[PDB]
Motif scaffolding. Structure first.
Motif, PDB file in Angstrom:
ATOM      1  N   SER A 115       0.836  -1.192   0.000  1.00  0.00           N
ATOM      2  CA  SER A 115       0.000   0.000   0.000  1.00  0.00           C
ATOM      3  C   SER A 115       0.874   1.245   0.000  1.00  0.00           C
ATOM      4  O   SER A 115       1.850   1.321   0.754  1.00  0.00           O
TER       5      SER A 115
ATOM      6  N   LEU B  16       0.446   1.324  -5.277  1.00  0.00           N
ATOM      7  CA  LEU B  16      -0.984   0.995  -5.486  1.00  0.00           C
ATOM      8  C   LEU B  16      -1.690   2.209  -6.084  1.00  0.00           C
ATOM      9  O   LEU B  16      -2.489   2.025  -7.007  1.00  0.00           O
ATOM     10  N   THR B  17      -1.381   3.404  -5.590  1.00  0.00           N
ATOM     11  CA  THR B  17      -2.070   4.617  -6.078  1.00  0.00           C
ATOM     12  C   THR B  17      -1.756   4.766  -7.564  1.00  0.00           C
ATOM     13  O   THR B  17      -2.656   5.138  -8.320  1.00  0.00           O
TER      14      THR B  17
ATOM     15  N   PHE C 249      -9.929  -1.075  -4.498  1.00  0.00           N
ATOM     16  CA  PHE C 249      -8.765  -1.605  -3.802  1.00  0.00           C
ATOM     17  C   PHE C 249      -9.155  -2.837  -2.999  1.00  0.00           C
ATOM     18  O   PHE C 249     -10.097  -2.791  -2.203  1.00  0.00           O
TER      19      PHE C 249
HETATM   20 MG   LIG Z   1      -3.810   3.615  -1.469  1.00  0.00          MG
END
Ligand SMILES: [Mg+2]
Ligand SMILES: [Mg+2]
Ligand SMILES: [Mg+2]
Ligand SMILES: [Mg+2]
Ligand SMILES: [Mg+2]
Ligand SMILES: [Mg+2]
Length: 169
Positions: free
Chosen positions: A22, A26-27, A43
RNA sequence: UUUGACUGGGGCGGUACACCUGUCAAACGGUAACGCAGGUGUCCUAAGGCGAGCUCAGGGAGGACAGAAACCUCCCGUGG
């Protein structure tokens, strides 16, 4: 000859990017999946805490989305072009579905961006025939009959018919 | 002036001293041993209240890195 309601179609295409942690990756992975489909993805968290993988429970480690209709059809074509329209015989499940993986997402005709990076992603194709939604409707929920079911062979043939693909042993 | 009680004598020990579950217990209920197997002195602003949607454990098959084990998908799944 054949009933028009027995025609195989793309129920949905499921795209999954399991980053494994994370934060920045992930972003950015979400932005890759968002701009590939035009849909904001969701997510997925980790069900366990695995020391080997460095993941804790309730930690967002993957990004996935579901696409349907024409948009799913055209994304699927890009995936098979990267795969050169060929798949191993074992890529097909016994429930009439199949899937494949893409190592680099810019192979799908997506411009690379330094502030995003390169990513791999997983493509799962769920086939179906008209009437499969009866297993999903709230009222009078029904289970599809044995003949309607798509066998592994009829998924492989459909792939050969539509995308003139190659099945490798 | 006091220095509890129970107790197969008393002391040591235990608490069978106030309670809860299954059994003993002999198909209503009640029923004893320092009978058997255990639990309690807590915990919760939700783990209370309502409503809504959803379906669980496990297993099979499949899917880039990914493997016994990360995440995604379908199938079976009377509650395991
Ligand atoms: Mg995130
Ligand atoms: Mg005495
Ligand atoms: Mg009393
Ligand atoms: Mg009785
Ligand atoms: Mg009786
Ligand atoms: Mg009785």
């Amino acid at each position: 000859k054949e009933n028009p309601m027995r025609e195989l179609r793309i129920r949905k295409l499921c795209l999954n990017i399991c980053v494994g942690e994370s934060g920045d990756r992930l972003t950015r992975a979400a932005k890759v999946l968002e701009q590939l489909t035009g849909q904001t993805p969701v997510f997925s968290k980790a069900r366990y805490t695995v020391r080997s993988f460095g993941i804790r429970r309730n930690e967002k480690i993957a990004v996935h989305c579901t696409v349907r209709g024409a948009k799913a059809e055209e994304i699927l074509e890009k995936g098979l072009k990267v795969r050169e329209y060929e798949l191993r015989k074992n890529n097909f499940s016994d429930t009439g579905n199949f899937g494949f993986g893409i190592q680099e997402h810019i192979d799908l005709g997506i411009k690379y961006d330094p502030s995003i990076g390169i990513y791999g992603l997983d493509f799962y194709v769920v086939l179906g025939r008209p009437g499969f939604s009866i297993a999903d409707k709230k009222r009078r929920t029904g289970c599809i009959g044995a003949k309607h079911r798509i066998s592994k062979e009829e998924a492989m043939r459909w792939f050969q018919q539509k995308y003139d693909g190659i099945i490798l042993p």
